[PDB]
Amino acid sequence: MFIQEPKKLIDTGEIGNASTGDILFDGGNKINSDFNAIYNAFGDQRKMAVANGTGADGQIIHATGYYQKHSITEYATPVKVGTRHDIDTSTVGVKVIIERGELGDCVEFINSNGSISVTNPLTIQAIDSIKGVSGNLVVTSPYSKVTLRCISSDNSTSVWNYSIESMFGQKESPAEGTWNISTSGSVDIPLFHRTEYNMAKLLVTCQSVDGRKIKTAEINILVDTVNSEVISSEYAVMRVGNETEEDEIANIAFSIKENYVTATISSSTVGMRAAVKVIATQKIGVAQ
Amino acid sequence: MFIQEPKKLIDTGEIGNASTGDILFDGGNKINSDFNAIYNAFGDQRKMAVANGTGADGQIIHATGYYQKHSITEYATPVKVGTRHDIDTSTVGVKVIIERGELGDCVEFINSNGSISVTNPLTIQAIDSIKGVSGNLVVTSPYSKVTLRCISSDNSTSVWNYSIESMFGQKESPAEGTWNISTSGSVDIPLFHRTEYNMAKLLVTCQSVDGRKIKTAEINILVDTVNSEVISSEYAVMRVGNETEEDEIANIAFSIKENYVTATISSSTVGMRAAVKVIATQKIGVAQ
Amino acid sequence: MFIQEPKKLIDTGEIGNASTGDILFDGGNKINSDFNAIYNAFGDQRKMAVANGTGADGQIIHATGYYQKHSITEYATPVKVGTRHDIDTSTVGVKVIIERGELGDCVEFINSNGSISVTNPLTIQAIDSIKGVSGNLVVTSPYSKVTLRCISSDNSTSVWNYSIESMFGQKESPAEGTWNISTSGSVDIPLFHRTEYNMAKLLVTCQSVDGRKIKTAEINILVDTVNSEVISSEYAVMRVGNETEEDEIANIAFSIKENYVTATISSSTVGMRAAVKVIATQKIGVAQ
Known part of the structure; x- marks a missing residue:
């Protein structure tokens, strides 16, 4: 290296x-x-x-940064803080040791060829220790992104914590915010174009300006593109200032308006607020 | 460019x-x-x-990195690997082509002005192909962050995979870890301050040191700040070593203690462990 | 600074x-x-x-980038765009002001020592304003990662939006894609090795090549390692082209095959597609 x-x-x-x-x-x-x-x-x-990294095929500055490909023998000695690694465990699991760190020090790993698995894992030993981990951190998630950060150094105590994420996938949220329920007692909130997702999951929390009335509910919706409709399944409903055990506080309905899957929220109570957040989606892609 | x-x-x-x-x-x-x-x-x-990028308003090194704003005519020719782009499809959708890559090569896109939509999308063609995609990758998620990485090159095969995420939003998790259920048979786990979220979703999995007994459950909780209480809705409960179809293995309750929404987990079985993770939250903000 | x-x-x-x-x-x-x-x-x-940052312990280029530790008095004056900050609110909350920005400008914050809380928060004022926020952005999530990006400048309007994420945690998804249901009318989709997670949550959406038939369902599964089985709880089921209110369109089952927790999807309808995505997981780690 x-x-x-x-x-x-x-x-x-x-x-x-x-x-x-x-x-x-x-x-x-x-x-x-x-x-x-x-x-x-x-x-x-x-x-x-x-x-020395020069020539027509010499080194270049990647705006996206770069993750180094090192060999097994090179990982025999502790890696410096601030380095990036693209791990290859295709022929055998690899172990990486990180030198003692100081508050904020970081080391990041990537797995571009997806070789990481349970039989050929990425074993990480961060000098001293990793919080919530007994001994080494053993990573078995292929095509993963692992980030290690030092959360405590001072002196004789070098502790690290980590995050593990998928390098790929559709993780975006098509909508998240808070909307007012107009005096008309109803509000339409466009979620996404009818062609973007087949299914979505949202959390809806409605509360009055004084917090006396409030309702929360989780909703899974299915986009029926053929009939231009949206099927929904609302559950885990919870309310606080409900006058009657039949009083909804706020009703949530779905449909396609102007070609956009849309949430329609209405309520009797005046001055009602409504937080809407899409926390998951699923789009049928192409097999393989 | x-x-x-x-x-x-x-x-x-x-x-x-x-x-x-x-x-x-x-x-x-x-x-x-x-x-x-x-x-x-x-x-x-x-x-x-x-x-040449000099002067009082000349170029500077952004620690956060930078995403370039290029014109349509400039995207007529393949983009180099390692580059970053802030896409603008305000007047028309734009197509970007990425030169053939090699294992680990990366190109990242951002959409600061939120112009990306179904009518003015971001079309990406990664020389050769994108896994799970037939032809070009068509992005229609506004204010999105798209990352493309080459997962296979060798020779005649240049395949890429991608990730799409929202640039904005509250995605943080207020708590994730594993706690021991003390010999007293009960444990309090502070989740978050009463004012941070109105609603939260957590997954709880309790298992005995020998794995003979185990229970998992999903729970949505609503923070009733006015009465200083927390309403909960536990579902999708699954158990394995339950002595009776009435034996819970572990009970989960919620309340506000010391002003922190708190999960109280108790169990008869001795040496019970409990993994608690908050996978979603909702905070009523300000409309608009 | x-x-x-x-x-x-x-x-x-x-x-x-x-x-x-x-x-x-x-x-x-x-x-x-x-x-x-x-x-x-x-x-x-x-x-x-x-x-001047030289010597044996002088400055070095971190491939992972670096987040600066500045003092309270240094934050008395607006921070430049493109800078990175590792916030320390251990003795008192700190306020940071960001100079007026231009489309795409960015500033990122990290909290390595986890000092951020409700009593010692990270208050951010982005010259002019932050969308969806009245006044300053008040961050109370410890060990958080905050990213601010300018989404509109032109002239007299400098608006920013933000994202807040946890620095740590297991966020990876063990599987996401689309698979064809072979003519045999059944397909096995390996999710993850039996030892990687105790619990997982997935979304499954099956649709016929013509979109006349479609079903979506959410499923929580529990890995019973001792009996080499997988317990499941399917809910929020929604269907569209169901011939009978008893016709499933597609059945989803789980088990351990070749030591991999596996989803088995079968259907009568020919040419059925199935999108499978794991949106959450829980692994019992070590207490503390």
Whole structure:
């Protein structure tokens, strides 16, 4: 691997005190050290073995950043903080050890070839320990994104915590916010175009300006594109200021309006607010 | 657009072999090429048209990175790997083509002005193909964040996969971990301050040290701030080592303790563990 | 704090017109300015107080980027766009003000020591305003990740929107895609290895090639590792082209096959498609 050297700056404090040759040589080397540091942090390090990362196929600065591909033997020694790794466990699980860190230090892993599995896992040992983990962190989720951050260092205590996420998938939410129920006692909230999702899950919480009346409900909806309708299933309903055990406080209905799956929320109570959030969706794609 | 040139390094191998003029000119140009490469990867490229990105309003290095605003005509030719784009489909949908990639290569898109929609979409063609997609990837989610990564190259096979997420929203989880049920047979787990959310959804899974007894349940809770209480709706309950079809294995209750919405988990069985995770929340904000 | 100066480039347009001393001094200073800009955007700025960030413990380029630790007095003045902050509200809540932005400008916050709470919050004022927020954005979620992006500038209107996420947690999805139901009328979809999760939540949507028949359902499953079985709870079922109010359109079953929790989907209708997505999971870890 390439272990950069800290930042070097040109000592302009000299020059009319050390002739050219000496200054240009010392300067250039410092400049090269710095650029190699930067380029290797945002570019493929495997290219250093060729013209020191120069040439027509030399290193480039990736705006998206870069995750290094290192070999098993290279992971025999602790990885530096701030580094990024694209793990390959295709032929065998790999273990990575992270040097002791300091508050905020971070190391991120990616799994572009999806080799991570239970038999060929990504084992991570963060010098000292990982919170909520006994010993090493064993990652078995293919095509995953693992982020480790140091949440406590001071002195003799270097503790890290982590996050694990899928590199891919449709995670977007088509709608999230709060809307007022107009004096007319009803409000339409466009969720998404009829063609974007087949199914969606939302949470709806309606509360009066004084918080005396409030209702919350979870709703799964199915988009029936052929009949231009939307089927819904509301459950886990909870209310507080309901005058009667029959009084809804707020009713939620669905339909397609202007080609947009739409939530229509109405209520008797005046000055009712309604928070609407889509927390999941499903779109039938193409098999395989 | 600005298409950087690979990394260039100063040939200190010369100097006391090529006079100053030649070395300073060749050096400076290389230095400028490199810095332009870096600055354009982390800064606004539209500024290059002014003093080559210099001046009081010249380019700067964004620690957060930067997403370039390019024109339609500029997207007529394949985009390089490692680039970032802030898409604008306000007047018309835009198509972007990504050059053939290699394992790990990445390209990320953002939609700051929220112009993406079904009529003015973001169409992406990743040289060769995108997994789970027939032809081009058509993005219609406004204010979205799209990430494309190459998951297979080798030779004649350049396949990419993608992720789509919302740029905005409250996605945080107020609590996730595992707690022991003390010998007293009960444990309180603070979830969040009474004022942070009106509604929350959690998953609870309790298992004995030997895995003979286990229960899982999903729970939606409503924070009644006025009466300082928390209403709950537990469902999808599943158990395995239940001695009786009336034996709960573990009971979950909610209330406000010390002003924190709190989960109280108790069980007869000794040595019971309980995993608690909040997978969704809803907070009534301000309309509009 | 360190407020970088815009990009500076070496004026090769001179040299055989201004002797060495003048060019090397002016050049070096520009080079240093640029590198300080880069290093301070991707490295610890607190090190500038020592040898200007040089030395054996000097600044380094973090591939993961870096989030600066600034003091209360330093936040008395507006923060520049593109900066990253690791907030510390351990002794008192801190307020940060963001200078007016332009479309796409971004500022990101992290909370490595988890000091953020309701009593010691992170208050953010984005010059002009934040959408869906009345006044300042008040963050009370510990160990959070806050991202602010400018979604509208033009002229007199500088509006921002934000996202809040947990820095840590297991958020990965073990499976998401679409599968064809073979002519045999049944398909097995491996979800994850039996040891990865104790509980999972999935959404399943099956639709015929012509969209006349379709069913959607939400399912929570519990992995019974001791008996090598999987218990399930299917609900919120919705159908459209059901010939009978008893006709399922598609049946979903679960079990462990080859040691992988597996979904088995079967249907009478020919040419049925099935979208399967795991939107939540729970793994019993170690208490504390």
